[PDB]
Structure 1
Amino acid sequence: KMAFTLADRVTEEMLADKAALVVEVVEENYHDAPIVGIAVVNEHGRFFLRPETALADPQFVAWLGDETKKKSMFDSKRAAVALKWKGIELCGVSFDLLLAAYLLDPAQGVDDVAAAAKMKQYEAVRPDEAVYGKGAKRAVPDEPVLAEHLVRKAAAIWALERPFLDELRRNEQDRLLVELEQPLSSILAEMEFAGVKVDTKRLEQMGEELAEQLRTVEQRIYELAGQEFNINSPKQLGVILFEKLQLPVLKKSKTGYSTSADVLEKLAPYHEIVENILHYRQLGKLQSTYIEGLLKVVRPDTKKVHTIFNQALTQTGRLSSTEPNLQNIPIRLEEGRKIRQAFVPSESDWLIFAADYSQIELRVLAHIAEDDNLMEAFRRDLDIHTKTAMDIFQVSEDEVTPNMRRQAKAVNFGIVYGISDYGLAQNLNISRKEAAEFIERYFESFPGVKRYMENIVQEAKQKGYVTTLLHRRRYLPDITSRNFNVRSFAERMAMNTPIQGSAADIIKKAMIDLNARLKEERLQARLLLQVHDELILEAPKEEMERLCRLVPEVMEQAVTLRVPLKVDYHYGSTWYDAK
């Protein structure tokens, strides 16, 4: 039972210039959430503070906001955002153990102090799930149990900083932490806190129209089935399709009949019900997920959504986005794309500005593989899919048909995401054998890419991991598996992670560079969102001309590759219009 002072006032010895700090927010969504307790561990001791005391104390608040008073934390964004909602600035966080653990091995799934500490044989700290419980039973425990937990977390941070930093340095990842992921965390905190304004009235009227179209289609489906059933139950729908209407079973799921859209598209010729089911699902997804789902997470006092970017989750160095996920808002189909008309600037006379990299992943591949053909294509700023078609099919540009371009694009999608010949076969509705032929023809036209793929798979086997341009790492222990599919996937990930992960590295560095430039230029523009290869901002209408020049340049110059980077941009009165 670890020693500490349960303090009832802040003292000067709590305000040392180096500390482990815990500012505990237990709610999963930390926006405008309570802080339940505070712990400080430093050279003078271990301290627990009640937040109503600490956060009302001017000296404690000044210390929190003093850049020269250095703090080590776990998940500093969570604390920084919760403090922002209370009007308190957190500065001086020089070490974030969450981000340190994530960089060392994203596959460990570190999401609490205990999990990080276990990586270095430190077990004098309980998992948060053990203290707070889970789901319905989740609760803040009584003060003695809470205070000991927060102090043990602070103690672990204090003890673990040096070994984590030492391993990062050995991995050549120390700058990645201190110069890239930590500064980014502050930028993400500001994006999240600013939020995105939503035109809820427009969403509600869309919901009304959708509801009417769903009722029409649903009724059509029942008259075509000759009975009512739950269309959203793949079990009940499978009985109607495959038993009652006797449609061919072209594919199964672990549990029953497949009703995936690609299966359904093949069955459309047999019965009118099928097109109606596909339309019902399209409309229902928009209704349940992007109208109703979105409305439920808009804050009613300000009509904004405040996402949380998980910076320490994905295996490739991408962010993820939650509550709402603003990285999967519809765009491909025009009916869904209209959802974007609901995402508006937060101030009158402001506009939405969106800038995206053109083919960043294939450009990164050109650079890392040093493929002469691919590097020449991007040096000419060619349409990469048309050029890929010319090469794999050996035809001139004016002989490339739409279908040839489509198939070439699919081969390029495959390379960008590292999918298998089976995956490409499925995407193109062709045999595995034919997909393998496509892939072989690609390697004849891009032999540098082939050499890269061979060379990286050997490197992953030898080292045990692969790396990205800015030294992000992904371990691939399955590369030696005696199971063909398992090993093949690891080999694809060896090839793919440096492409996907380097693209994540670049856009992160661009975000950092852009925030610095916006401040230097005294612009009011602010970053709202990142969507993997694109950045969305809002700014006064009077700043658009400057941003047209500034934002693409900053993004294009974030790194210097053997090929140029190219950024496209658009702006308008809503996110829909920034196209």
Structure 2
Amino acid sequence: ALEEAPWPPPEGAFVGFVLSRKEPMWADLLALAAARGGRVHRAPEPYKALRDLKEARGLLAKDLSVLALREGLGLPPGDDPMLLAYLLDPSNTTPEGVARRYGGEWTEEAGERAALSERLFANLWGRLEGEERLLWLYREVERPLSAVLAHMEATGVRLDVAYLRALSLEVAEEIARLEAEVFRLAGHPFNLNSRDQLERVLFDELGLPAIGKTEKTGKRSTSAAVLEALREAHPIVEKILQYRELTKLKSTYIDPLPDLIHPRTGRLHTRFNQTATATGRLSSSDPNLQNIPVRTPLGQRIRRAFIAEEGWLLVALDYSQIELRVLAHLSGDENLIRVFQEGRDIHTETASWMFGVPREAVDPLMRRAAKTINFGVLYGMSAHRLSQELAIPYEEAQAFIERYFQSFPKVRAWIEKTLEEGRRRGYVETLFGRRRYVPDLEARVKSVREAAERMAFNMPVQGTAADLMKLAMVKLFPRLEEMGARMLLQVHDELVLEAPKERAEAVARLAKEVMEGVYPLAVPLEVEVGIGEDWLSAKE
């Protein structure tokens, strides 16, 4: 089809490339090609050939930009059909699916990938004609954001390896104590990591009551929520829960992360996936640095391992009560607007009530648990579940849900308005017009339809918060480059920056103002900021 032409391609050509593995910071570049003008250009040696491109345009452009940055090359990502497709329909998450849907096949050959990129861009650009709000999201948020994310991925974050190595040995001994006690109490050994074997021990051998079932297979559940209901029914349960806490943290964070330090940077590199969620959030993988522990004492020790370069400090910025502020703007509830114009904190107020203590007496943990309650109730938690979570009667949980919504009466009205337009249109949208298609709003099975409803009216709130965070990153990044600071991590409504010590205070003030003023709403956005040598100390 396309005519074979010699490398290098003309400027503006679409790129195709093949990696030895999905992670750009770790991949060998196996092949590189470009397409334009009815021609395909295949690079004889892909690494040297990278130097000839001025921009990465095509499928997965950010990934190639990250690998280019790793090699010390300034190759910014530009147009990417994945971003066009993701804005049309966020279920467009993979190149295999986007190709099949919009006019090609995702193969394992760079030249074909280049040609595909060119063809898909033409077609998806056609599909977005007249979709001015989606085009605004593309031009003003997603396309420039991909350059920011590429820099973040290639920079990475420093980890106190030696500290985590020592911690692993300590936690191993504590796990053995717990495992040995569980085996003694069971009367025999078994694989405590096997929920099938544990199910048999707890409910058949020890005759404990089984209060819940698993979704797909209908086994008697051994989840923490079920075990919590049995803490006093048998001493083994407590040991199991402690075993699970420690093995989760050791197997997921303590042991794996030190092995992922990159040999050239000496740092840890995540991937920020831009077309991965139904709501417009980013995701993080390989490793996921958006679920680093924070709750328990051991979790906090793990978070302390994330440190600044010597002579630098971390700056952590996190939006206050962000989805409740977004809800206030979307719904227009005067009571909820007044809450934020008055400086009130709904998480602290729920915590004080939950634990029966003055606001002053609430600590960050109790507040973070009240946060779960406030959003749980908002997005549809049942009184049955709430009464279990809070250890109160069904009747008192029922009453809490009623007063919650009676306090902000326009919220329920906004919920039902959102679902009505989602039924008529087939999608719901954020403040900026990002869409999520929810066909099951018309489902004839109530449980399916009602699950769809909770997904559907969550998306405008969570997605607007994501749009705002993304726009803030796009605005903030060039200001940080000017000041010699780095953007390292995003955790949905939070940024972790790295700044020279002498500039950390100025960077913190600037980043806070950029984030708070990203897009004025009917309520102020407030950002909490901290500075410290480690991630835990920077969020205090």
Match of 1:198 among 151, 159, 165: 159
User: Which amino acid is the alignment partner of residue 39 of structure 2?
Assistant: R
- 1:214 matched to which residue of 2? 175
- 1:565 matched to which residue of 2? 525
C-alpha distance after superposition, 1:392-411 (max 9, x if no partner): 9xx9989x999x99997554
Distance, in Å, in 2 between the alignment partners of 1:171 and 1:479 is 26
Match of 1:65 among 30, 38, 54: 54
What is the 5 A alignment of 1:437-516? 437-516=399-478
Give the C-alpha shift of residue 299 in structure 1: 2.3
Helix, strand or coil: the match of 2:262?
A: coil
Give the C-alpha shift of residue 258 in structure 1: 1.3
- 1:105 matched to which residue of 2? 89
User: Which amino acid is the alignment partner of residue 65 of structure 1?
Assistant: K
- 2:39 matched to which residue of 1? 46
Match of 2:22 among 28, 39, 43: 28
Helix, strand or coil: the match of 2:524?
A: coil
Match of 2:324 among 336, 359, 362: 362
Residues 80, 121 of structure 2: 8 Å contact kept: no
Farther off after superposition, 383-392 or 31-40: 383-392
- 2:98 matched to which residue of 1? 116
Q: Does 1:323 align with 2:286?
A: yes
Helix, strand or coil: the match of 1:305?
A: coil
Q: Note closer, same or farther for the CA distance 1:102–1:431 as it changes in structure 2 (3 Å cut).
A: farther
Give the C-alpha shift of residue 159 in structure 1: 3.4
User: Which amino acid is the alignment partner of residue 529 of structure 2?
Assistant: Y
Residues 20, 157 of structure 1: 8 Å contact kept: no
Match of 2:116 among 149, 153, 157: 153
Q: Does 1:290 align with 2:253?
A: yes
Match of 2:486 among 526, 529, 532: 526
In the alignment of these two chains, the number of paired residues is 534
Residues 198, 343 of structure 1: 8 Å contact kept: yes
Q: Does 1:4 align with 2:9?
A: no
Residues 101, 164 of structure 1: 8 Å contact kept: no
Helix, strand or coil: the match of 1:277?
A: helix
Give the C-alpha shift of residue 353 in structure 1: 1.2
Q: Does 1:186 align with 2:147?
A: yes
- 1:74 matched to which residue of 2? 59
User: Which amino acid is the alignment partner of residue 61 of structure 2?
Assistant: S
User: Which amino acid is the alignment partner of residue 2 of structure 2?
Assistant: A
Distance, in Å, in 2 between the alignment partners of 1:442 and 1:376 is 15
Give the C-alpha shift of residue 191 in structure 1: 0.6
Distance, in Å, in 1 between the alignment partners of 2:467 and 2:16 is 28
Distance, in Å, in 2 between the alignment partners of 1:37 and 1:88 is 17
Structure 1 gap segments, 5+ residues each? 132-145
Residues 84, 125 of structure 2: 8 Å contact kept: no
Residues 15, 114 of structure 2: 8 Å contact kept: no
Residues 34, 111 of structure 2: 8 Å contact kept: no
CA RMSD of aligned residues (A): 2.9
Distance, in Å, in 2 between the alignment partners of 1:262 and 1:336 is 19
Distance, in Å, in 1 between the alignment partners of 2:409 and 2:473 is 34
Distance, in Å, in 2 between the alignment partners of 1:316 and 1:499 is 9
Q: Note closer, same or farther for the CA distance 1:505–1:155 as it changes in structure 2 (3 Å cut).
A: closer
- 1:312 matched to which residue of 2? 275
User: Which amino acid is the alignment partner of residue 300 of structure 2?
Assistant: R
Q: Note closer, same or farther for the CA distance 1:438–1:126 as it changes in structure 2 (3 Å cut).
A: same
Distance, in Å, in 2 between the alignment partners of 1:269 and 1:537 is 45
Distance, in Å, in 2 between the alignment partners of 1:80 and 1:150 is 16
Give the C-alpha shift of residue 343 in structure 1: 1.0
Q: Note closer, same or farther for the CA distance 1:478–1:318 as it changes in structure 2 (3 Å cut).
A: same
- 1:143 matched to which residue of 2? none
User: Which amino acid is the alignment partner of residue 477 of structure 2?
Assistant: N
Give the C-alpha shift of residue 470 in structure 1: 1.8
Give the C-alpha shift of residue 533 in structure 1: 0.9
Q: TM-score, normalised by structure 1?
A: 0.85
Give the C-alpha shift of residue 257 in structure 1: 2.1
Q: Note closer, same or farther for the CA distance 1:418–1:21 as it changes in structure 2 (3 Å cut).
A: farther
C-alpha distance after superposition, 1:154-184 (max 9, x if no partner): 4423532531442xx4262101001101111
Q: TM-score, normalised by structure 2?
A: 0.91
Helix, strand or coil: the match of 1:290?
A: helix
Give the C-alpha shift of residue 72 in structure 1: 3.7
Distance, in Å, in 2 between the alignment partners of 1:227 and 1:555 is 56
User: Which amino acid is the alignment partner of residue 439 of structure 1?
Assistant: I
Distance, in Å, in 1 between the alignment partners of 2:82 and 2:267 is 28
- 2:295 matched to which residue of 1? 332
C-alpha distance after superposition, 1:297-321 (max 9, x if no partner): 2224543111011110101111111
Q: Note closer, same or farther for the CA distance 1:428–1:485 as it changes in structure 2 (3 Å cut).
A: farther
What is the 5 A alignment of 1:547-562? 547-562=507-522
Distance, in Å, in 1 between the alignment partners of 2:60 and 2:440 is 30
Q: Note closer, same or farther for the CA distance 1:416–1:541 as it changes in structure 2 (3 Å cut).
A: farther
Q: Note closer, same or farther for the CA distance 1:401–1:557 as it changes in structure 2 (3 Å cut).
A: closer
Residues 200, 303 of structure 1: 8 Å contact kept: no
Residues 4, 46 of structure 1: 8 Å contact kept: yes
Give the C-alpha shift of residue 24 in structure 1: 3.1
Percent identity of paired positions between Structure 1 and Structure 2: 42
Give the C-alpha shift of residue 467 in structure 1: 1.0
Distance, in Å, in 2 between the alignment partners of 1:261 and 1:204 is 28
- 2:48 matched to which residue of 1? 56
Helix, strand or coil: the match of 2:27?
A: coil
Distance, in Å, in 2 between the alignment partners of 1:406 and 1:311 is 27
- 1:546 matched to which residue of 2? 506
User: Which amino acid is the alignment partner of residue 67 of structure 2?
Assistant: A
Give the C-alpha shift of residue 84 in structure 1: 1.6
Distance, in Å, in 1 between the alignment partners of 2:221 and 2:131 is 49
Farther off after superposition, 29-38 or 151-160: 151-160
Give the C-alpha shift of residue 446 in structure 1: 1.1
Helix, strand or coil: the match of 1:267?
A: coil
- 2:71 matched to which residue of 1? 86
